[PDB]
Amino acid sequence: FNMQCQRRFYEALHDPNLNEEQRNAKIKSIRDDC
Amino acid sequence: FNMQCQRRFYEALHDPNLNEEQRNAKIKSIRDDC
Amino acid sequence: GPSVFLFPPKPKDTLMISRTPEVTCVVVDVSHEDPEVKFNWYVDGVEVHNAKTKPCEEQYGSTYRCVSVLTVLHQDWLNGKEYKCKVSNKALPAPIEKTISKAKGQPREPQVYTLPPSREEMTKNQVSLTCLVKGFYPSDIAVEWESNGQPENNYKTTPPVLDSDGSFFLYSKLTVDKSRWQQGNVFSCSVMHEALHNHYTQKSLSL
Amino acid sequence: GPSVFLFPPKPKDTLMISRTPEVTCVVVDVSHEDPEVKFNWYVDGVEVHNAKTKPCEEQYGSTYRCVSVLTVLHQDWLNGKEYKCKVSNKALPAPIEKTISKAKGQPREPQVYTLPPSREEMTKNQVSLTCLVKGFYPSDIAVEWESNGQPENNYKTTPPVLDSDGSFFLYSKLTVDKSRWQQGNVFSCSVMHEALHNHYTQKSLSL
């Protein structure tokens, strides 16, 4: 699997500066543009 | 547990020179007398 | 009458962004006279509509099995959201509802340790490469093996065992010919768990 | 109605002449109006009389459960004799029969391998001593730990896992304080199985 995207997923998942809406959008971006 | 008796039990259990009757008796003596 | 089962996603699918986690609703023993089922799906009680429901399939007893599959967002499953399947049928006065979610409780990070074959096992034609995974909570986990950037599929993993401190452990055993092991090939245990950084860690094992 | 379960002896009890193997017949959900059961025991179909039957006891609800325990000969269990429990009660039109015996198949001897703690686990307060037991059939087995001639009870053992060659394996893990491990104490994994010489083997592990 692509370890780059997995790292970006995890960092977004646990980013305390993101609320649920911002976290979903950034995870959706990783899911879609990897 | 007593390892002596356990050895004697196992030897009686697998002795090819004992039929079921003779094996039961040797095993019963082991279990009864030590 | 018809009975309903609701299955959670595979642990690996919830953890790896490359996968698609799904929740699976299975209704069995739908009568032959009323072969039609309707599924409703809900996330924390709010209906969702993206389910893939395939047509019902007839079984031996002439009753019908019917499966609906709901894909879920990784972060919603990991954040404890509650997934509900409702099954409606004419043979039923009231629809059946089952609900599932992730195991509750503070997550705990697995410690991963590789243990090489003992000297006694080296006398055999095949040896056991051991991966000990201990201290994790909840019990959802995936363990895999690779070598030289290729998957090794000849392993068996024990079910998680509840330890005395409220955490789980398991062992994974990869069997390899002693010749492969003695030629110094590097093997790796890969563990996927919610409480690991990146949900992923890989431990190596080599002679 | 009333239902009957028949439990095999403990694997250790059938193997060690110091122990007494027993088969246990449990009937639950006996009506309150007929708090009366009759046990009949049979070995390969021939009635035997040595069972110890305790009086029925009533549970929550009004129903009763009723237990009968039959001691068996080690060699008879190991040699595949078939033990049958017949439960009779006035509520039941027909008595209920249950039968058990040892798993059948060529016995295979377990290979026992102790694995010391990973060098990376020596940074923690406690370490894991591992006993790998593989290649055994049938799955009936007992595993215990010792040190300095005294039992060590702080272990967890996985249930047996069927391996791909028709044999079973398991791991047993003994948790010890690292200090105990580092001060040179000898620890022992003891395994009991019908395919071991003397039904018993013990393997040691130390720094």
Rounded to the nearest angstrom, the radius of gyration of chain A is 9 Å
| Strand segment tally of chain A | 0
Shape of chain A: flat
Helical/strand content category of chain A: mainly alpha
In N-to-C order, the SSE pattern of chain A is HH
β-sheet strand percentage of chain C: over 45%
Biggest beta sheet attributes of chain C: 5 strands, antiparallel
Biggest interface pair, counts? C-D, 27 and 26 residues
Give the quaternary arrangement of the chains. Answer: heterotetramer
SSE series of chain C? EHEEEEEEHEEEEEEEEEHEE
Provide the β-strand percentage band of chain A. Answer: under 5%
* Tally of contiguous helical segments of chain A: 2
Q: How many helices of chain C does DSSP assign?
A: 3
What gyration radius of chain C follows from the Cα positions, in whole Å? 22 Å
**How many structurally independent domains of chain C?**
2
PDB class: immune system
Keywords: fragment crystallizable, Fc, immune system
Assembly: tetrameric
Entry title: Stable Effector Functionless 2 (SEFL2) IgG1 Fc Scaffold Bound to a Minimized Version of the B-domain (Mini-Z) from Protein A Called Z34C
